[PDB]
Symmetry: D2
Subunit: 208 residues, 4 copies
């Protein structure tokens, strides 16, 4: 079995993206006989699709877990649904702010994630990790990647399982916000890393 | 030197109080030259006061750092002000819900914390711990203890430094709250423990 | 031209549902030459569907605006997407808590709202009414009804336009909640009523 | 009887301050036999004290209700306590940013509001207006004015009743913030105006 994990580079004026470190830390690990591949994606429309599709064809994973930063969110969230729409609340990293366009013209309006989301959530809770089901991944780069990955699955027959995990800010990202107004929630890096490993294990369990 | 650290027991139907664990962990340890004593206070009006005065008179600490749970808070908070009032939003652990009463009749309306609060915050930031200055400790058991402590100092000439640190929920407290609606912020236990050791260090440094 | 507006009965232990009162205030009114029909729906899976579909066939509206209460939301929200799923966070008004079930087996995973959502938002703004686009209607009764309505449109060819508006609590609903901590946003009833009329006006203008 | 109501000018990038309109709308009215004076204060340290102390001396009111904007707050808030401290999170309207300074060196650490805060809150509730007691007025211009007014009371014997009321944004202030992402709570201007009249009414009734 092959597992792909993706993360994103820094965006939105942030110095770091904890998911870039998660992808790098998960690259090369094994869970049983399963090999994990971790790759970092650009927060850039068009370019993220090219990198994603190249990566999928290269690796042909059985399971793809895509990870993103969700600023302001207080627990791990497991995305249920990917939507065939872009409406960027902020520009991508190249200043491209796409509004009310499909991701893939003519493709289904949405795809459900094919990860065992409820079992993933249950297992995180057992591990002491706050987690819930999210019903919108936004309409920016996280959703864009989530949708393209599920579309690839529906269209190519691989990955068999695909979904998205959003993570809170890590505490060090909060320091800079304190002298500026409201203080967003955060979660320690080590818990976020473990919260990505858990979906892989649960997914590998459920597959075959 | 002697440092008192108090925590509180569980309250409001919570299974746990992280500050109880913190007091018990810091108990008996030494930070530089100073001995640290860790005591757990009851979340009970009257009783907490008796326990607190007995503990202060017994130990005669140079520094008192009082620690409480602040549900819904997303970073470490350092209390600036203790207020001469009780207005309980919920009953204490014996079912007493005291409304509109002084803590100490005739005593001042408020006392400023005598911890070096801004230096504590600066040190917490450079250690990667999100922290801010809170201007109200509530009017339940946290503020009661914070007021009685600072009053004891002004009245008896010790501790020379006294103050209050509120901590968020730890991740494991969040798990049961997921099925039931909104999802409070949390902070790892390890980070909260370090965030109380730091106030001791900088307080010890600012004294003599 | 014929417009159906729906609201919901009280639920989740609430004494009132401001959308029940909105639907009653709009029932029988005319917007220019357009006849409006207001109907209150039960917060009951199954029964809501029977009532909705019967009402749709009875009236055959050109435009359907479905309105629901969204506790904790601070502005008017216009729903972009309906999702083919039920995952009830609380039971419905007959105690039914349905989890991870399709609304219509074999139908599209999602439908986009066919209201002119951006022109509605723009119009509300210039009317001084805070409004935004929501990308999830939840997976309870609002989404259920939103989906069934858009399904009827795609499948029967009427309504021509269909969509969903969520409203905050109205200020009176906040009174009893002030004791128990969290103080939710609200919006005056009059503004909420005006914010439902605006979609009718914009939809009518965009049709033919 | 004579009644002083103050509000503030716009600050912090905001086009309007609703408390400015409130003060101007209340000026010159009578509540029963009592005469209401409405004054707009500058959001400027030093100048606001000069203006406040001059107006208090000129009018010598029996009751002083000071009103201000609290961005982010979801209901009316009646301030319990003013504190003898300035710790400005943002500069004032003249670019001055005071950090960790007392308001009146020598004066008490805090004064309690001498408005019948609990009766005001009870009456606001019966009127369908959400309201709660706040235990911190911040440490910017609202608290500065709250403190100086109560200090004036204790020091000169007038005003006999002094206190502070904070109001949420009004809905028209929210519109430009929807692009910016997050969407703060608001309250209708009409409800906010009514909500400062009630304090005048219950305070007059309290004073003989």
């Amino acid at each position: 079995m092959k597992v792909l994990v993706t993360g994103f580079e820094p965006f939105g004026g942030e110095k770091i993206n904890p998911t870039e470190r998660i992808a790098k830390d998960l690259d090369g690990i094994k869970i049983g006989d399963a090999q994990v591949f971790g790759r970092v994606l650009p927060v850039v429309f068009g370019k993220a699709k090219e990198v994603l599709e190249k990566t999928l064809e290269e690796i042909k994973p059985d399971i793809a877990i895509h990870v993103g930063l969700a600023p302001g969110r207080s627990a791990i969230s497991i995305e249920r649904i990917a939507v065939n729409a872009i409406d960027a609340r902020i520009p991508d990293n190249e200043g491209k702010k796409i509004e009310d366009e499909p991701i893939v013209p003519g493709a289904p309006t949405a795809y459900f994630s094919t990860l065992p989301i409820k079992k993933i959530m249950k297992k995180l809770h057992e591990r002491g990790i706050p987690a819930y089901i999210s019903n919108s991944a936004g309409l920016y780069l996280s959703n864009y990647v989530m949708y393209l990955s599920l579309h690839h699955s529906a269209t190519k027959g691989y990955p068999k399982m695909s979904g998205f995990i959003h993570v809170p800010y890590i505490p060090e990202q909060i320091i800079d916000k304190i002298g500026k107004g409201q203080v967003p929630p955060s979660m320690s890096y080590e818990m976020e890393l473990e919260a990505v490993k858990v979906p892989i294990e649960v997914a590998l369990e459920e597959l075959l």
